[PDB]
Amino acid sequence: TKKRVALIFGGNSSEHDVSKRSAQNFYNAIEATGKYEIIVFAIAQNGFFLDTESSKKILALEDEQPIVDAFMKTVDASDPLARIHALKSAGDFDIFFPVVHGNLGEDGTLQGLFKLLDKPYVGAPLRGHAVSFDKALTKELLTVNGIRNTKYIVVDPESANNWSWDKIVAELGNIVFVKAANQGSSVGISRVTNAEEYTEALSDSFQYDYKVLIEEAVNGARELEVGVIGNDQPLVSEIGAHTVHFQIPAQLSPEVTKEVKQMALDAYKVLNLRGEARMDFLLDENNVPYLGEPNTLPGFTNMSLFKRLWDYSDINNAKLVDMLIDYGFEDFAQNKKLSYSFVSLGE
Amino acid sequence: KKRVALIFGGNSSEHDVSKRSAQNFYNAIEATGKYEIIVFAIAQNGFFLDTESSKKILALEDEQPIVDAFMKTVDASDPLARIHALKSAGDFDIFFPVVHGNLGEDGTLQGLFKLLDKPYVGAPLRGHAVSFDKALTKELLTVNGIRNTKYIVVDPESANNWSWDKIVAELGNIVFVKAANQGSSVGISRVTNAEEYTEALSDSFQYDYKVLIEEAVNGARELEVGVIGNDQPLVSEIGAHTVPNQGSGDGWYDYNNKFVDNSAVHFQIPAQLSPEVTKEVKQMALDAYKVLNLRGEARMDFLLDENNVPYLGEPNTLPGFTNMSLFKRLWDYSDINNAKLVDMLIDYGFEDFAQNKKLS
Numbered sequence: 049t050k051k052r053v054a055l056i057f058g059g060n061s062s063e064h065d066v067s068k069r070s071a072q073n074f075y076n077a078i079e080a081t082g083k084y085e086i087i088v089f090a091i092a093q094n095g096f097f098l099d100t101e102s103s104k105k106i107l108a109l110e111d112e113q114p115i116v117d118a119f120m121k122t123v124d125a126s127d128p129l130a131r132i133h134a135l136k137s138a139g140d141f142d143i144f145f146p147v148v149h150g151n152l153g154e155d156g157t158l159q160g161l162f163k164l165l166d167k168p169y170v171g172a173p174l175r176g177h178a179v180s181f182d183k184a185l186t187k188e189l190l191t192v193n194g195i196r197n198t199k200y201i202v203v204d205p206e207s208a209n210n211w212s213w214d215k216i217v218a219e220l221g222n223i224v225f226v227k228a229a230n231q232g233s234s235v236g237i238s239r240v241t242n243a244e245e246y247t248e249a250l251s252d253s254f255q256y257d258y259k260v261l262i263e264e265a266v267n268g269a270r271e272l273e274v275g276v277i278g279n280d281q282p283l284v285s286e287i288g289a290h291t292v293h294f295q296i297p298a299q300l301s302p303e304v305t306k307e308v309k310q311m312a313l314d315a316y317k318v319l320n321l322r323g324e325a326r327m328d329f330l331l332d333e334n335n336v337p338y339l340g341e342p343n344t345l346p347g348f349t350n351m352s353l354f355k356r357l358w359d360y361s362d363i364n365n366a367k368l369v370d371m372l373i374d375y376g377f378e379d380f381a382q383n384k385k386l387s388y389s390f391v392s393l394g395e
Numbered sequence: 396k397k398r399v400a401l402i403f404g405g406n407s408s409e410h411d412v413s414k415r416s417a418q419n420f421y422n423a424i425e426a427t428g429k430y431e432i433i434v435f436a437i438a439q440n441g442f443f444l445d446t447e448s449s450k451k452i453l454a455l456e457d458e459q460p461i462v463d464a465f466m467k468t469v470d471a472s473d474p475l476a477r478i479h480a481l482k483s484a485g486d487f488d489i490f491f492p493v494v495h496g497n498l499g500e501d502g503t504l505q506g507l508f509k510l511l512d513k514p515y516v517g518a519p520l521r522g523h524a525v526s527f528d529k530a531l532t533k534e535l536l537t538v539n540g541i542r543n544t545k546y547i548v549v550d551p552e553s554a555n556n557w558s559w560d561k562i563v564a565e566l567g568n569i570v571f572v573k574a575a576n577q578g579s580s581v582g583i584s585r586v587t588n589a590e591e592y593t594e595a596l597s598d599s600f601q602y603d604y605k606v607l608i609e610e611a612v613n614g615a616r617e618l619e620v621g622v623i624g625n626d627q628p629l630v631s632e633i634g635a636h637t638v639p640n641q642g643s644g645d646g647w648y649d650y651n652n653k654f655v656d657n658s659a660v661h662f663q664i665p666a667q668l669s670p671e672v673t674k675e676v677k678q679m680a681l682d683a684y685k686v687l688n689l690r691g692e693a694r695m696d697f698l699l700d701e702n703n704v705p706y707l708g709e710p711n712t713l714p715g716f717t718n719m720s721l722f723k724r725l726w727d728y729s730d731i732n733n734a735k736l737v738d739m740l741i742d743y744g745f746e747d748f749a750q751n752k753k754l755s
């Protein structure tokens with residue numbers, strides 16, 4: 049109605065399609081408040097930003113490739129800023145609302161661009177996304193801070209050489225997970241139980257990153273996911289447990305519930321997160337909760353957990369997205385007080 | 396033939412230092428004779444300036460007049476106005492960031508480099524991000540067994556729980572208070588009493604909402620070591636420097652001793668150390684590089700206690716390159732002068748960009 053929101057979706061990842069679905073439910077939520085004007089932008093799998101008109105169609109779920117191909121013919125290959133030129137195609141706006149799942153929205157890249165343009169945005173700062181995205185970086189901060197998670201080892205092409213399977217077993221056990229540090233959703237992940245699987249797991253993971261993480265596996269089969277939103281004073285959702293069949297509120301003992309919610313809160317702060325996040329846990333056979341991977345940009349599709357978690361806290365989609373936008377505006381205001389002055393130099 | 400986008404300046408507390416480092420890097424690249432250079436300045440308002448207004452700023456001409464002039468040609472309706480100047484000279488092949496502080500060492504510029512999909516010299520986004528936050532750095536070092544000072548991290552609310560008596564009992568009567576995300580010794584204070592403590596908390600909290608309070612190492616001198624490369628990084632010789640009344644007094648390497656007046660500090664290359672310590676610092680530097688996720692270039696600084704025990708002070712992802720900067724001299728002792736230095740740094744940048752394409 050006045051304030052303009054730039055809703056960005058898409059991304060050069062394997063989760064390109066899931067992004068479109070999340071973007072739609074966010075759009076409807078922002079629209080349902082009647083306070084802002086939405087301007088949508090899409091990022092094709094080739095990294096290029098698309099104009100508002102082309103992206104409006106892609107959001108509607110129309111065949112994407114023809115739309116992209118047509119756009120690529122209007123691009124000037126001699127412009128070093130061509131990949132982001134389409135961002136001005138619809139004029140000035142007030143705040144970015146990122147919903148790009150994968151290697152652009154969760155690793156901190158887009159957030160760098162947002163700061164350079166001195167414009168507000170929703171979600172965590174670039175540092176927060178960067179630490180939450182890097183598998184190794186996440187475990188190191190959580191461990192030094194006392195938040196329970198599995199035992200692990202970080203290797204590279206050369207160090208991996210000092211780690212025979214027998215040594216890995218002495219440290220982590222006979223059942224481990226090998227994986228590329230920076231990579232998302234799938235590839236580079238392996239379930240190792242013996243020396244044969246380990247040798248080939250390293251070769252595989254070393255194709256997606258030069259830094260591999262090896263961690264022991266939790267025996268228990270009970271996934272827990274909790275949402276957290278806010279800045280200086282975070283809110284924690286109810287717990288969703290596995291009984292894609294999520295049970296809410298999770299049926300755990302009063303003690304396990306408060307412990308899992310506290311870990312989610314403590315983790316959010318040590319990981320330097322802001323705005324929104326989903327904390328995924330693993331509960332073993334003795335009801336001991338282990339914080340797994342943090343999610344800086346959760347899915348908002350019809351079937352994803354974050355789409356209905358806040359309903360159990362009386363926060364509907366409209367209120368939720370409105371809170372996310374207020375937090376974004378607030379943090380920009382706080383960072384505006386910070387000084388970057390200095391005593392002028394000379395000869 | 397290849398074009399190099401030398402960027403400097405930025406809205407940062409180390410804005411003027413960047414100027415000095417920039418001219419030097421320019422001359423070094425020019426000396427190789429294999430690259431063309433396009434200079435880009437970023438004013439204090441965060442606006443990139445055209446290649447012409449910038450060449451003048453590099454030549455040391457007054458900034459403001461040249462900036463104001465430029466600001467009258469800006470389209471204030473364009474959301475991409477701050478970075479529009481980047482196209483004001485055509486296409487280039489690689490980025491060479493020389494902006495110290497707030498934009499180059501925190502990951503911001505590296506975010507843009509990834510979007511335009513061009514190679515670049517220096518560490519990746521996560522490296523700078525993790526290396527600039529003083530608290531995140533010391534956290535990654537501690538969990539890896541890399542020696543660093545005892546400290547506590549607080550925010551404006553958390554700060555009121557630590558009264559002076561509580562601090563003295565936890566870290567001793569001489570402590571250093573600093574803003575987590577800063578450089579060149581700005582936002583940092585040497586604290587010895589209750590009034591200086593509280594005055595310093597206020598001073599630090601005007602540069603960041605996160606400050607560190609760490610115990611002071613009574614050592615008479617500091618150490619610096621350069622490290623470059625990607626998957627198989629090299630380590631330079633250790634360099635040293637000491638300010639008047641450092642150990643046997645209150646003197647320290649503040650903003651005034653580094654850039655205002657440096658004609659009173661003593662430097663040693665290589666540093667006078669035992670074979671043991673020399674080996675220990677070179678390995679700590681190497682280890683910290685990997686942990687911190689750095690690439691291309693860096694400089695590791697150390698604190699030395701009375702008994703000569705080394706403490707990893709802090710990493711610097713885009714180290715200074717001025718006429719009193721150690722990163723401009725150290726590599727000469729490894730048969731790598733300023734020329735071969737930047738040629739290697741540029742090759743590293745291209746090699747990592749190429750390697751990155753395959754890893755997908």
Ligand SMILES: Nc1ncnc2c1ncn2[C@@H]1O[C@H](COP(=O)(O)OP(=O)(O)O)[C@@H](O)[C@H]1O
Binds near residue numbers: 647709
């Ligand atoms: N814990 C400490 N013990 C002794 N001296 C310190 C300590 N911390 C900082 N200093 C002094 O203050 C200066 C600040 O350095 P540093 O912490 O690396 O910050 P900056 O980013 O400003 O270089 C150092 O060069 C050193 O002389």
Ligand SMILES: C[C@@H](C[P@@](=O)(OP(=O)(O)O)[C@@H](C)N)C(=O)O
Binds near residue numbers: 696716717
């Ligand atoms: C004295 C030193 C400064 P600097 O490189 O390092 P510090 O952050 O420790 O000041 C700084 C520019 N970031 C030099 O130029 O080499």
Ligand SMILES: [Mg+2]
Binds near residue numbers: 577578
């Ligand atoms: Mg520094």
Ligand SMILES: [Mg+2]
Binds near residue numbers: 696708709
């Ligand atoms: Mg220093």
